[PDB]
Amino acid sequence: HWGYGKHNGPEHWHKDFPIAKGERQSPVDIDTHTAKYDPSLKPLSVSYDQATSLRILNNGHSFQVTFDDSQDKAVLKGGPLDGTYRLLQFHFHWGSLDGQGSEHTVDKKKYAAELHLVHWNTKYGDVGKAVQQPDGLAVLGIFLKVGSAKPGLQKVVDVLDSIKTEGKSADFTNFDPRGLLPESLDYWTYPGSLTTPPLAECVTWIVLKEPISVSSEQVLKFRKLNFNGEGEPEELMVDNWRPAQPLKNRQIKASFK
Numbered sequence: 001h002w003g004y005g006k007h008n009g010p011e012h013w014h015k016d017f018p019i020a021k022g023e024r025q026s027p028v029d030i031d032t033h034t035a036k037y038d039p040s041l042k043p044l045s046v047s048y049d050q051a052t053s054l055r056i057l058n059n060g061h062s063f064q065v066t067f068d069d070s071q072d073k074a075v076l077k078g079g080p081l082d083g084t085y086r087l088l089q090f091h092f093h094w095g096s097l098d099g100q101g102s103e104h105t106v107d108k109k110k111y112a113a114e115l116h117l118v119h120w121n122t123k124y125g126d127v128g129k130a131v132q133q134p135d136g137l138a139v140l141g142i143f144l145k146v147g148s149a150k151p152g153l154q155k156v157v158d159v160l161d162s163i164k165t166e167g168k169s170a171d172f173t174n175f176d177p178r179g180l181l182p183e184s185l186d187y188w189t190y191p192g193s194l195t196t197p198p199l200a201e202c203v204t205w206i207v208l209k210e211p212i213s214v215s216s217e218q219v220l221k222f223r224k225l226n227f228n229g230e231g232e233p234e235e236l237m238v239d240n241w242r243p244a245q246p247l248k249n250r251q252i253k254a255s256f257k
C-alpha cells in the first residue's frame, strides 16, 4: 500500500497508479515570473458561513476535517470556476522540519505545510462521480509558514492527541474554516490532479499567494501524529507531501498583477 516511505513513497506510486506520470499532475512549482496575470479571472467566492463540520479523522496519510456536503452549505465559486463546488473536507501536508512540507512550491520555495480545502462540482452530484471529470474538483491550497500562531487553527491542534494513529476519528462539530484563511484571496490557478493516489486529473487548483502563519507549537503537534495504527511500530506522520511534478503543457494563471 502506498505511503511516504522509502519503499512506498511518491517515486513508487506510478506502479499502482500510472497516471502519476500523466499530463496534468500535481503539485507543481509556481514560477511567479512566468505565471501570466489573467484580467478575465474573477475574484474567488468563498462562502463558508453555513459550513457544518462533522468529524476529524487520521486517515493514515494526513488528518482531515470532514463537512456535510449534502447541501450547498460551504461552497466555492467564481475565480476560474464554472458552477458551484461544495466543501467536503480539508487536510494538511507538512514536514519533519519547517523548511519543507508544502506540496506546491513558489519559485522553488517550500513552505512548512500546506492546507487543502477539497471541493467538488455539484453538477456531478457526488464526489465519486466528480473525480472522474476534468473539472470535477476544486482544491483551495493555502501555504503555512511558522511564526505567529493562527488562533483559528488551535481547536484543530488541540484534538490531535485523540486521533494519534491511523483510523481514529473524533467529533469535530462547529468548526469554522474561515479561521484558516489569509487576508488576501489573490491566487494562482492551473489544471492538475489529486496529490495522493488515485492521482486523478480532476482538479482545478487555486493556490493562494498569501500564506497563513502558524506557531511552532501548532506545527509541532502535527508532527506528533502517527502513520501507523494503534499498537504498531510508531512512525511519525511527517513529510506527507508529494514533490513538484512536471508542468508539461500547462500555464499557471495569476489573479493579481
Ligand SMILES: CC1=CC(=O)NS(=O)(=O)O1
Pocket: 002, 003, 004, 005, 006, 227, 228, 235
Ligand atoms: C515513513 C513512512 C511513510 C508511510 O507512509 N508509512 S510508514 O509508516 O511505512 O513509514
Ligand SMILES: CC1=CC(=O)NS(=O)(=O)O1
Pocket: 157, 160, 161, 162, 163, 164, 221, 222, 224, 225, 226
Ligand atoms: C498527534 C498528537 C498530538 C498531541 O498534542 N499529543 S499526542 O502526542 O498524544 O498526539
Ligand SMILES: CC1=CC(=O)NS(=O)(=O)O1
Pocket: 116, 117, 118, 139, 193, 194, 195, 196
Ligand atoms: C482528496 C485529496 C487528496 C490530497 O492529499 N490532496 S488533494 O488536495 O489533492 O485532495
Ligand SMILES: [Zn+2]
Pocket: 091, 092, 093, 116, 195
Ligand atoms: Zn492534499
